[model samples]
Target chain A: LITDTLSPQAFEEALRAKGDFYHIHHPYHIAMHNGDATRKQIQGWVANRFYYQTTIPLKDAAIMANCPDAQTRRKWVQRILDHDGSHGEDGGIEAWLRLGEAVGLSRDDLLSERHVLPGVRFAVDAYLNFARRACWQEAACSSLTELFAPQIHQSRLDSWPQHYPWIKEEGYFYFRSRLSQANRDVEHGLALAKAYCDSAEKQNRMLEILQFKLDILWSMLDAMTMAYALQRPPYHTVTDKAAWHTTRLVLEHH
Target chain B: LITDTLSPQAFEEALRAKGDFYHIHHPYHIAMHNGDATRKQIQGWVANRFYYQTTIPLKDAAIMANCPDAQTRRKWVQRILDHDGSHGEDGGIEAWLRLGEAVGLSRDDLLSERHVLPGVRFAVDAYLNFARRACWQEAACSSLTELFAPQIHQSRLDSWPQHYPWIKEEGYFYFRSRLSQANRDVEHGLALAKAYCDSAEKQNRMLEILQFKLDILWSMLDAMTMAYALQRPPYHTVTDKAAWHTTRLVLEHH
Candidate 1:
């Protein structure tokens, strides 16, 4: 990721290049983006993927709390609170509740520790371990894919409105809000990198971190996509669409 | 909607006020440096509201195409593409897809036009109607909520990962992109409103439009909360949370 220096003026072009690459290449992405995956496949993906989401902030916070300097920690600590939301109004949990509702799960059901699968658990624990084990810059760079996020988000935002009207006004806001937040996070993170990684060794390490981070994110997605697509899922994968639809816990139906 | 204005300064203030109101109290916004609505709800909004998103570029194109002069249209047309995304890789729709994935919906489902609700259809149509029926200034003012959108979006972008760990890495990226776009959009829209609304008719209409647009957005959330939280959801509301939850969806369990 940091193999090269992307000046602000040149970053958008680089970002655009990344978007094009994902659109044109990336086998799984092409499959998912082009609509090859099925409902059951998505369900499988979701069911098995819950483990990763569960422990995300804990690791993120751990990284922040463990930051060696106040300034670095200060710079990163807010990220945890930022995506999650504070006290009352909006936050990740609430959005997930909305997601739970959209997909037919009750907030209580989603919140309960009752139904998660083992494969999902391993994947998430792995992510936590990676985050915990990685150095701060590596951890930060591990999230480089964010640079490519804005492009894909808008596509879905626009396309979903036309395709899935049932979802109209229900669960979409969470993603929309995150798009803006992700952009800023990337921007700030990039800026932070610029400030801290003033040498080639550091930049190289940042690159490695980004690759590691991408691997972490990409692995979960891989598991999810495979499971949802009805391909041979991992032995430990937890769910399929039939189970999702039949789950009585979901009060909201698509 | 526009008819008149007391003065440029007065009109700007009114516009600023409209912007401020949204900044302070958008329904989707809660007063945090970072905030988020549900991703499923967001997807629902985007899926049903694609027409509105679609309308942005067309109108901007129309504004440019119909500006009676190349300079005016040239000045205005770019803003349209900014919202709509012409190349498809980096446009509004593309960005939204990342968001849809973030909340757990499939790209095909999001793009397919099968599931969005009817009420969202009406609300989004109303927005189009307002833009189509009203004067240019009036239409521009209707989008005034975006002026505040950037600031609040910044806060949310800054905050998301903290609050919502289950959120896909892609979803967070998309929101980050919008902040810059929103900022650019707001700057341009404010200028457009200031430039066109030459009288009080425009000013008052602008005010009404701002309120109206905010209400449109606000109502969408209201519907979600009622349906998801209070069980007062309209006919098209999603009643199931379990369908979307994969074992992996619950980050806590893993």
Candidate 2:
């Protein structure tokens, strides 16, 4: 009910196939693109979202290290370095910084990441730690969201530009780069997940892993929304008024 | 007197006032910037150099978390995200990948980091371990290279263009960004070291810390040169032929 559990073609037919599979409608579409989202919100999204942004590789490194096979290990290890700039300027981070700059935060402060919250660190660190401790079953399942990413990314591409326009020509570079990457991941992962989950033992392992992955992503956003928008007290928040002022000023322009 | 104790200013003056820190006068200096260097040689450099580049942010995070005061912590925490890019192709890690690409390696395999030697992992992990274990007095001493970095960076800047014109522009961006940063580190560190070592009790700790840092850097390079460049055999060396070929091609064009 929660996942397709079969190939896309079969899954599509399953909606009407009507069998033991209850096939309850559970809509979980992802949006990867920010097509027209003006520079401001994108910048805020980047700067504020950086806490999560930063943890991807750290977690992947742990996962790659834990992997036992040469080819599988090799396959995952390379994914970590994809967006690193050619040197320091022309890569993924630079594009995000470009987004940040277009929206108006001091590129220096945004890159510095000084104003990030402690909760962000805690949540991100927890994911890395979990990956470090996770078994192979847990690890593979944890990555099941690859199945959802392609669709989500398509929606993102479709809707983002429609909603926001401050996004300059190059601003969507990160999203475009992800299109191929997300597709490749989903292609490989869908079969891999189902094969692993064909039996009860595998299904149990995958279900647990998916739950854990969801927890990591959930905690990540919870921390961001809570710290940035809610501004709840007691957490170690960014005390720099100047940084926040720029963030707001930029967002206002968008 | 090879690094005998002195008032902080005296120690700094000794290194800075001496102009021979980076260019010429040493094999490490000459070897580091040679454009015609062989792939084996570069691999040797990377294997060892990986130790340092790899540990950079963990060390920074440690410094940020341990800084007792908020302002100091804020200053250090910002460095974390700069080196490690966020979600997509947007951070320093991605930029480093470009450097890897320039050097000739498959981005996928390199990012996976599977090819790194056991020694590389050991060395990087040790740094994280040290940061977690060492106290502030020693940590401050460990960062003493800050005193020497500004001078070395300047020399590298002066010599880089002629030595490797093609890669020079990107290299310059990386190094120039550090010029101001290294100065800041030196200024901040001088006061911290001076204050800590002013007492007889901490002076010896300071010396030990400095020695440890030097050993760490030296040992890392030794491992790489031995494993990859020297063809010493099977210690887990980077093997992305695609990357290697690409790097040579880039250099040829340059």
Candidate 3:
């Protein structure tokens, strides 16, 4: 039997076929979604995940830096502004920091990165490094995870208030803010992947790239699971104090 | 009054203080060492860890590539040869594959990397990329985790046979080989770190670098804990098939 390369329409379906692999399915996330997660678990996630939320601009900038296409860069810089904020507006990072406070973490507690698990740190830094080194088209395509993000964001926006009404209303800003932004971001990323992945080999590689991005998201939850859920963080056998390093990853030095 | 930097002797003490954070304290490794590890647990570790063992040369080569000093290069090439094997010796990788077989995984099972977990893959790749991009001294010093390696290897050599005599005798080759080699390896790594990290800031950063390496090892265990111990490998709820990408990291395309 012979087969042809997937059409753009089907390729998009193939992309969505990967949605089941999204981190929303992770038990840690499901627990949080259902409000079964304890206060400590929620705080652990918010503190550790702050490490990732803070990395979004750097990942975006790498894609922007590597890209030679003006129109793409023009649209891409919006992601940075969405996270870093413009002159008048507070952005995603600010919103996340506020979420931290809302979750009962001190600004320095989230800012210090002391709670960030090594697994989560490695996963987040892996995304930043991949974007820095990969071809811009592929790196931009990596954002295809955004195709799946709006739903996760909206899930939080809808579920958390009722599940754990203790969280401040302001903390919802980051989730609500991304609900539309992810869709807007997703259209650009999908267009890029569809246009660039013309051959079957290219399509599979693009699929692999997106899976890599998905694995990054899933791995972040796995880290949180190991820490907060399983209660088996690094050095748990030796000491109770936070043992991971506090600064950003060494690769983030640039 | 400001305090002066500690002497190299005290700095050495500070470095060993990180030993408690070593993966040896990890529940997975502790379980393995205590002989409580199931056959499946042992097999999972072997398959996932071959991914780590296989990356050794690439990491060593990255250090050699980044170093400007010929003296260091001449000494460093030995690390590659020791793993990749010099002349006729089978080397650590081949020895590890034998360990895989000893644990009952087919040769192809280990070579194919199909069983390799994403958590382990990402952690292993992080070290390789860090080596490729960091300064030679920092990159080389990252190997100081070897300072704690001899004991782990010896622990396995001493206990595994009595606990799980089903494993092949040849499986111990890699562990036995590293018992002495790690001490030899540690001398050069420690010498380089101590000399290069002269200032308090540099010493602290070097300490951080060592912790990063330690975290890589511990995080590998955490990944295993997630997959095997917790039974939560990615998409486990949706599919029974192994879902992680089997290929090396896309960055390894170099």
Candidate 4:
């Protein structure tokens, strides 16, 4: 509603202020960081989170599909490569798989999305749906949550190794990888936000959009909080068995 | 991969067996039936379930879009009308809204989907995505979950009036309406499954698809269980405040 536009530095500062709403502040996260989370909690998190890790490429590809600018597309495609990896390098997806194994989960467990809570699944899909449907610039800006990502990645890297020595050393690779990749990605995203949101209305809308992105992150942890930390997964009272649905694979011939 | 196909009667039995996995067997459903659920639990279920009720027409439309047969399209479009209502007639959606009110939820609450668990959202989206991506025949066959739907509706109709006398009498209208509607819908769906899945392999695949549909229903309850029945909603441990994300209104100007 402000009629006047702020300077780019001020606008960027406004965007940075949204870091207050990040999932790092959520109790589930704080629990994990404080070494209070159980092995089950850690394993459930990795398995559920794998769904999100795997979707980064799909979300980036969606942005690329909508973008007409070759410059943006060129910059954006690296995200897909960063997660999906190049010809020989194991990407973030594989690193996440290693993390899953480190926590005593099977590769099939991660790949099948069998352990994925509906809450986690929906929150992640909301992100992908936003990317697929929004303007590429806005979608790119949503990625600016990555601005706050390094601290989270660093928190895990710092505390996890010391707190949970049971986890394999290789499992930490994805966290270590994101420490750099997220920073590099955010630089581009912040620049895009500052460049595109030049009007006051646009700036306010962009901040709200950034808040929307923060909500997605925070909401994901909320779901995890309900399911894992609280021991209140989908069928907790009804059955002790893991009676949730498994994915149905379409026939290769079909 | 048997080379032989079963008789139509046998095919129907195979379809009927999938009822064992239906959400009716879910403990949450059992809790509601047993009159052990709190008013909050019942209200939460209604509000969360309104999301699935509204998506029926959209899912049906996706099926019709993929279908090429005029005969099938003619049959399928009725589902859209059934949920969305038609000229001079209120549909299942209206019936659901009344149910929400009966359970002490506001119309806006049901429409806003504020109470929907992440688990439920993903579970429902999985159903819609399958309809969008799978062959129309397969999608239509999945709707054969309606084959078992009448029983679930009847269970509520038979039980709710006596057990939860506090609920408004008018709220049971949707369950009553679906009793006939589900019966009518499933007749066509069973015929379609029997007609199309003539081969042994095809029949097995159809059963798997049926299982997928059952998973959708069961998973939806699983999410509800985590949130409502178990009292472990997203962010419950940290804040009693509803910290989950609301839908972002995409900017018309931007």
Candidate 5:
């Protein structure tokens, strides 16, 4: 629908407008920030979000696979390192695990992934699959969801403590870390989108791509809302049990 | 885990065993069959499923793109025609729209897909993405989930009328049509799996692939269970309005 070539400033403005629909505005998240979410809701979110946290490196690697430029590759590789950390124990994923612990989930409870709703798994996998198939610039631009990430992380840092004082302070590290990293990631990605999406067609396509990424995030919250906030895990009609299969399949193999 | 090649009969048995995990057993379907589901539940199931029904051709076309042989291509082409009849009005997709109407959904409501949960969209997209990426044979074997389709289709026909006589008889046509077509499609996909998965590694990989396909179907039910049966559509906490974006992106342009 965007018919004319947009100046870089105009393109950036359009991209920022997309932030209005970001997951930070999701009801599930709003509850978490405003203290309306239950302890169970908080635990479910940390556990399910672990899946998305674990996926970051793989998405980055998929982009790297298609990217040939050395500087771009070098810069892109940091995302993998950011999530993976030095040995996978000191990074964003690990930070999320600690967040899970703060919320009352045991390590295996998060690690087993049975607690993850099928909806969350599907939404996250949709993102990873898109990265695997899309051109690098398109895939990288999709990460511009990070454009709104700093605020979402800051929202948690601002309110989670006074409301849920029992939450381990150490668990706050991930959100705190993302405060800086997300802005840095966004700058690179915003630059990539502005430069690569120079034509009306590419710019429009990138906007859709950004919406697709936003949908993935919004959908993740929808799953959490259903499973945690609403107390309706899969098969809730017949039995009260976590019925999702846990396989970090082909995701890890590659 | 299957370290040795399975005899074709044994392989067939293993594949069939996966039926135990099919969506047929999903509590959502069980609820529908026993008349335990409310009108909204049935309507939700029909509307969301219209999405899966629409995607069948694109999934098959993805496989077709990767498949090389004419015999397979000739046979595969039927899946498309079976879903999309001449000029697009006669096949399975249309039949499903009628099913939607039977369940009280206007054609526009079903076609618009605002009711399609992000969970369902993600699950169905997962299957299509798999077909797009896997070897043609791998993709075809994944369709072996259809090996269980006849029983699923029959369960609907056998119980739906007695349970909900309000539904139009004509809406049942799609299920009835699949009863025979599934068997025929299964015959081919089963043969393909048995022949292609002749080695231990291949057999094991095929088993995992089959499980991956099963997860997609089961996951779709999870979304329905969350949204319809449980009354927890996306953003249910803050608003009752349907908040999911309804763009049928990337799936259509290809």
Candidate 6:
């Protein structure tokens, strides 16, 4: 429906404007940041959010797999390294494990993903599927959600330490690390969006794609809200146990 | 956890025992059968379910694609044909289209899949992804949920005609058709399961696989229950409309 194309600056502004609808604005997030959330709520967020963090490398690897441009793949592979880390470096995933521990969850608890809500799993899996199926450019553009990522990370870094003092000091490392990593990611992702989305149709498509990414993040919080905040985990009345499906296999094999 | 390899009869019972946790027992389904579901719930169920029905052929085709055994491929290709139709025969997908029309949804409305909940999409897509990735036997065993399918379909056929007379007479055709079709499917599936799952480890793995399939179906209704039954569709507070994601491409392409 978009017939008019905007200048690159305007396009960048449009992309930035999307930050208004970020998941940080969700009620669950607001409660967590305001320190109104229970310890259970905070722990649930860490455990569930860990699933998304773990998938980042797989999603990035998927993009690199689909991508043929050696130059693009060369830059994109850094995301995998950032999350999975090199031989010596503890990656974002390791940092996330530390966050999980800081919040009273065990390393095995987070790694097992038993506490992951079905809603969160579905949303995160859809992201990996998108990266696997979509054209690499669109898939890369979808990562433009990271454009808003730094703000959410910064919000957590600022608020969690002050509000949830029980969380260990090391837990904040992931957020602090992502502040620079997300900024770096967005620079490349934004360049891809602005350069590739030259036509109005492409621009509109990219916006929809970006909206889809935002929806994924928003939906994740919605699931967490339903489970942790609302006390209505799937089948709460029929069963008190976690009856949701668990992915026993590792992502690389999956 | 299953340490014993069961006799053939015991294995059959174990598979049928899974019927206890089938979607028929889900509250949303119970509501429908008890005539407690509103017309909107019925319509939403029909529209969302159309997504699952349409994916059957694609899932079967993926099985066929991965299957190298001529004998197995010969048996599996019939599943694709059954749903997609052959010669002049109306397929199960066509029957579902009629079911949608009977529920007052336009063909375009169901086909557009705009109303398919994100939860349902994820559950259904996971099934297809499993078919594409798992070995042929494992994927084939997953379909053994069809072993329990006929009873659910029969429940609808018996109840809908009397409870919801407003639905078109032909609307029940898909359910009626599946009564026999599911029986036929389970026979082949059970045979494959019994012949292939001879080891204790394989038996345990198959049980896990079946649980995975049951989870997918149960989760689909859980999503429906959340959105339609509970009146908490995704983004309900932000927008009155359904803001779920959709795949613009067809399932085959996806």
Question: Which has the higher DockQ value, candidate number 3 or candidate number 4?
Answer: 3
What tens-digit string does per-residue lDDT give for candidate 3 at A27-108?
8888987889999899999887888888888998988889998988889998888877777867777767877888788889
Scanning candidate 6 chain A in windows of ten residues, the lowest lDDT window is A245-254
Pairing residues by index, what is the TM-score of model 6? Answer: 0.89
lDDT of 5 by residue, A63-131 (tens): 999998999998888787777766534766777777787777898998877677777888998888888
User: What DockQ does every candidate get?
Assistant: 0.01, 0.01, 0.57, 0.26, 0.35, 0.30
lDDT of 2: 0.46
Error of 5 at B126 (Å): 0.7
User: What local lDDT does model 1 show for residue A129?
Assistant: 50
RMSD of each: 24.8, 24.1, 2.9, 4.1, 4.5, 3.2
Total clashes for model 1: 117
Top-down TM-score ranking: 3, 6, 4, 5, 1, 2
Best of the two (1, 4) by TM-score: 4
Query: TM-score of chain A for each candidate?
Result: 0.68, 0.63, 0.90, 0.89, 0.91, 0.90
Model 1 chain B: worst 10 consecutive residues (lDDT sum): B242-251
Task: Provide backbone clash counts, one per model.
Answer: 117, 32, 0, 5, 0, 0
Give the residue spans of candidate 2 off by over 4 A: A1-254, B1-8, B11-29, B47-51, B85-91, B150-186, B234-254
What's the chain B TM-score of candidate 5?
0.90
In candidate 3, residue B137 scores what lDDT?
95
Candidate 4, pairs of clashing residues: A118-B118, A118-B119, A119-B118, A119-B119, A234-B222
Candidate 1 residues lying further than 4 Å off, grouped into runs, are A1-254, B1-5, B20-28, B31-52, B59-66, B86-89, B155-158, B178-185, B236-254
lDDT for B74 in candidate 4 is 82
> Higher lDDT: candidate 2 or 6?
6
Counting only residues 3 or more apart in sequence or on different chains, how many pairs clash (N, Cα, C under 3 Å) in candidate 6?
0
Q: Write the per-residue lDDT of candidate 1 for residues B1-254, one digit (tens) a residue.
A: 24444677677776665443342342334522234556555555555455356546654543343245555455466666666565553766666666667767777766654444323333443454344444454455455566564544445345666766776886757756752553134566677777876766555555655655654554333333333333332221222421111111111121
Give the alpha carbon lDDT tens digit for every residue of B1-254 in model 3: 01468788888788877777877778898899889999989999989888898888889998888888999888888877777776686666777777888789898998878898888988998899889888999899888777776444555345889899888887665555643443135578888877887888788788788878888998898888878877778778778888766665454441
Q: How do the residues B139-174 of candidate 2 rate in per-residue lDDT, one tens digit apiece?
A: 544655645543444563545456555453663465
- Residue B173, model 4, lDDT: 60
DockQ-derived CAPRI band for the predicted complex in model 2: incorrect
Q: What is the TM-score of each candidate against the true structure?
A: 0.41, 0.40, 0.92, 0.82, 0.79, 0.89
Worst 10-residue lDDT window, candidate 1 chain A? A245-254
TM-score of 2: 0.40
Best by TM-score: 3
